[PDB]
Design a binder for this molecule. Structure first.
Ligand SMILES: [Ca+2]
Ligand SMILES: [Ca+2]
Ligand SMILES: [Ca+2]
Ligand SMILES: [Ca+2]
Lengths: 661, 661
């Protein structure tokens, strides 16, 4: 139930084909680990691998490394004050959390020799046999965390702080984002319940309301994250650029700022494959669009022809099957997105991650909303254009066996089926399928007889995949997109997503608990490029919900109404965006006062670290001595009234002279 | 042609009604001036006033004050580095310009005793007889500056820097803004010339073009001003809050940041008179709107009735008279705006100035564009609603003497008459009327017989009004508004404004030269609240130019077209705003590199101001001695393979064992 003090575990798969070269890499690896002061320990890994175990046996060099990284943060404006202790007397002032300790150990194993480390990143260096470097998982904290999160109803800030001190900043930002989003989802849940009871289907007021809610939630989260970045001492980390190890280069050019020749790569070679996104984008758009329009034509052909013998529920069976098939096509889609992004040689890890978020968000946007767009914006306004598909299905099924009435409330049933089966498929794919996978490999399953269970748990933890938080961001961003631009089709969607988010805030916590190895703790200022995604989804929601409520509320479609509704709701979005930004500028979050007060008090301590007429007539006497040494008329003008009492009495007699005249 | 070294002149009007009290205030004034180390000198002022003259006779206390203000800038993040010289050996490192010197002297005469100064601001303190504190005007620089600006065609950056070193930062920001705006006006001048030749009246392409030009000009100026604020060492000054002297208060509450009890004022008392703007706003809107609709009805009645005996030029004579009357009504309008803003008790000078800019911009917006709005958006789409005014004028003029055909190209003639007579009225009111005023008071017009002409020039300089740069900002912002939202009515407006701006960049320079006393040099990071005005005017231009080109291009007015054109051009504005912001993020202005490079080099100098296996087995031996003193199984696990060569050979024999199995 407790580790052996091990901070990191390296896998180092030794295949039989390259045994001697992998042995030379092994001895070079453990040499390089011993140079940076890591006590090593070698144990057996299954299928010919060598689990080596590292730790800092030297607390003095560890505190020296901690002080060096704190100075590196202080140079880039991260820390408020310097450590001010080259000796370890600042560690008692500010302790090291487990996340900061594991991050600095990972930097000592990851950074190159110029940075003061033994860089053993797998693909770029010679270390092609280093499979995975990963920290361990403390089960005594894990079980307590899962139990205390399942027991409570709401989560305080101390729970997110306990996530911060043991899983880095990024996982804690995800849980803080999901907690704040779950708390803000109760407003359109209640208002959608009210609109589903009272206002009838497709109410305009709920469209304006969910637009306003998306604005206030996005701006409030953008305030709350800079508050959290002040509180965790991580504000401004995105200015620091981490050099990606797999970034190839050609030259080593002039110094930008520091004095160091940084390695460069010709950007036209980058744009040559940046433009590889565009034919891939158009190809994937038309492929998924042809699949979606084929599914839509098939379901309308089926519910026209069979006339619903069993149920009308059987009519949207192709839509249900398409949503079921959507995670499988999105798997190869994200694979071909990640391969394309990795081929696009990116300099720093921030830009590489941001481009991966952009490609993954575009592909998931298409495969999550193009069915509902073809339902709302194509099928409802003019649905006669898919009649060749209908007569094609008729001419095929007539040989195979040997009046359209486009319902405007088809989108409500479609959105209900979409939300429910997407909830079921997402819940099955997220936890239940890995639950039965780990229970299946549980029933399918020397070494010093005391450390046996420890090496058992490490050998089984090597097989798990590393937890990426990008996917759990993307799921919630898409759910927010459903809320922003399709809740007017089905106003109980916010209530369903509220229940899903309360289950999800424990479910994704369970995924980090037992279905994935502990992620390498990184620091981030924010959720990063997902803020652009939330902003774009809210802006598109203000257009789309209004056009949906006009086109489904529908008389012929008077296009004088549609453009006016789109214009009014989009300008209402812009006006409420200005209003909420102006209001949230005035709230005076306490972290800003704390940061600027500490900075001013430190520089005020530096400030404190750093008769009259006598002086005036003395300098006038000095200038008179310089005049008598020798330019002259201003000298006479200043030497008229030298003493101040002379000026007083001359001014008073001049008041008397001006009183005479 | 040269001063007597005088830095400041104080007027101190002594009326005969309060002669003894003003004399006591005089002796207290010159006492307080002598405490802060200012050599004083009293000369006669006309109509019973006492021009006292100050200077720093003590360069040591002046350099001490300079170092104190530089530390005050360094605490608030303005300066890159500290002065690092309590002795005056930093003044040789960075010299004092005349603007910084005069600003610090004005702070020594303006700041209270707690700040280390003798605060003699007129209305708040007892000094109700101090009329005006003002610096002098160096004519040898003035004549050279006017001559070298009239000789050149274009102005280099060195001219704006010579304005910066002698008139502060704010006047130099105005001249830099007018130079950059005059340089960017040549693009819609040439394109409007092309549209006026080729494309015919009311072209949509010119509307999209001037929208794009307004975007690129506004974003390029917003980049250029942070570049200039880096270069002049003034970046970040807007974070510093200057306490307004006339700000009344009730309490002196807790300390926000510094430690000082700041004085507070109940904000509900402020909102009580903030809401006095709204009935004043609605009253002024309906008053100017009734005047404009009366003028419009009168001119259409006149050109209907008389049928143009002389000319059609005589028909818009009421519009010409209304533009002529516009500076006179705007005078009392800005008076009642400034009185309302001064009644609204504002804490700091930044918020007070920003609210004055907001009120003045709203009133000048109405009186500059509501005539053209009632022409374009009311008279052209539906003009039958003003027929009661027409029959009213008929029923009056029928007793007084004893078919409408609304032309869509009426706005072109209106905009031409508006631009031309506004140019003529603005040029007459700006320079020519003060030119004949100063030549009229020239022909209408003891004391030691050597300083006679100096006291003559100071006595005549007291009568001039202090130059406010807000008015010369507001004129150009309104001209930019004409370009942004009405150039499609008359595409030569940009060419006319280009010629006007080339004349204006010397004319407003002449106004500071001889028609106004030298302004007290202030520091500002930017043009401030006018950036919101340019952004709002460009955004409204994207709507208004498109609606104008549809409604005047006009068939009946198909309102399916109007909303689509407004929507397309506004979203084109938003898309090109994103595009230009993304492009200008990548240009890498050199001032940012210079600032962050100097900051990193200073903190890197502070950074530089601040065997392996032996240590590893030594700490392992220490922990073994602690174990033998006595928790134990991890100790045994770490003490298995102590030395690194032991780990090497144990790992190699384990490779051999995994090779056996
Ligand atoms: Ca899930
Ligand atoms: Ca998830
Ligand atoms: Ca002018
Ligand atoms: Ca002007």
């Amino acid at each position: 139930e407790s580790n052996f003090g091990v901070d990191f575990v390296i896998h180092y798969k030794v295949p039989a084909a390259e045994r001697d070269e992998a042995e030379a890499g092994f001895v070079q690896l453990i040499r390089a680990l011993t140079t940076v002061g890591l006590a090593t320990e070698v144990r057996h890994g299954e299928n010919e691998s060598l689990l080596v175990f590292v730790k800092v046996a030297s607390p003095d060099l560890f505190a020296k490394q901690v002080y060096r990284a704190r100075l590196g943060d202080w140079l880039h404006g991260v820390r408020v004050s310097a450590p001010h202790n080259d000796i370890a007397q600042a560690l008692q002032d500010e302790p090291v959390v487990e996340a900061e300790r594991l991050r600095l150990i990972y930097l000592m194993i990851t950074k190159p020799h110029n940075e003061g480390g033994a860089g053993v990143t797998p693909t770029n260096a010679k270390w092609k046999h280093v499979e995975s470097i990963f920290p361990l998982h403390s089960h005594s904290f894990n079980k307590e965390w899962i139990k205390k999160w399942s027991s409570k109803y709401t989560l305080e800030q101390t729970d997110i702080d306990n996530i911060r001190d043991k899983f880095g900043e990024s996982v804690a930002f995800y849980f803080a984002f999901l907690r704040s989003y779950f708390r803000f989802l109760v407003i359109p849940s209640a208002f959608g319940f009210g609109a589903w009871l009272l206002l009838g289907q497709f109410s305009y007021l709920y469209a304006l309301l969910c637009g306003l809610w998306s604005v206030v939630f996005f701006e409030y989260w953008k305030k709350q994250e800079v508050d959290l970045a002040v509180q965790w001492g991580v504000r401004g980390v995105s200015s620091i650029q981490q050099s990606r190890p797999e970034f190839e280069w050609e030259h080593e050019a002039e110094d930008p700022i520091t004095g160091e020749p940084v390695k460069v790569y010709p950007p036209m070679k980058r744009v040559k494959t940046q433009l590889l996104q565009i034919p891939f984008a158009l190809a994937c758009v038309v492929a998924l669009g042809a699949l979606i329009v084929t599914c839509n034509s098939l379901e309308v052909f089926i519910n026209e022809v069979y006339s619903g013998p069993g149920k009308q529920y059987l009519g949207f069976l192709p839509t249900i099957f398409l949503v079921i098939g959507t995670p499988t096509i999105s798997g190869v889609l994200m694979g071909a997105a990640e391969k394309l992004n990795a081929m696009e040689n990116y300099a720093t890890v921030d830009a590489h991650d941001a481009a991966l978020i952009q490609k993954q968000f575009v592909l998931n946007f298409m495969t999550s909303y193009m069915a509902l767009f073809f339902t709302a914006f194509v099928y409802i306004p003019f649905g006669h254009i898919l009649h060749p598909f209908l007569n094609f299905w008729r001419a095929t099924a007539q040989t195979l066996t040997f009046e359209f009435q486009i319902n405007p409330a088809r989108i409500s049933n479609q959105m209900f089926y979409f939300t429910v089966t997407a909830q079921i498929v997402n819940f099955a794919t997220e936890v239940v399928v890995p639950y039965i996978k780990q229970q299946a490999f549980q029933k399918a399953k020397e070494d010093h007889e005391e450390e046996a269970e420890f090496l058992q748990r490490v050998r089984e933890e090597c097989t798990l995949e590393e937890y990426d938080v990008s996917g759990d961001y993307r799921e919630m961003v898409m759910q927010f997109g459903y809320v922003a631009m399709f809740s007017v089709a089905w106003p109980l969607a916010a209530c369903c997503f509220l229940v899903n988010n309360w289950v999800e805030l424990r479910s994704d916590a369970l995924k980090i608990a037992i279905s994935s190895r502990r992620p390498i703790p990184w620091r981030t200022d924010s959720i990063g490029p997902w803020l652009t995604a939330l902003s774009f989804l809210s802006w598109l929601g203000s257009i789309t919900s209004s056009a949906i409520v006009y086109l489904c509320s529908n008389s012929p479609l008077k296009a004088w109404g549609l453009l006016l509704s789109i214009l009014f709701a989009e300008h209402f979005y812009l006006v409420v965006q200005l209003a909420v930004r102006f209001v949230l500028s005035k709230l005076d979050s306490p972290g800003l006062q704390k940061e600027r007060k500490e900075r001013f008090q430190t520089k005020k301590r530096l400030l404190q670290e750093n008769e009259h007429s006598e002086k005036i007539t003395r300098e006038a006497l000095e200038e008179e001595a310089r005049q008598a040494s020798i330019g002259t008329p201003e000298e006479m003008f200043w030497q008229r009234q030298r003493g101040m009492q002379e000026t007083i009495e001359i001014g008073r007699r001049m008041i008397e002279q001006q009183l005479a005249a």
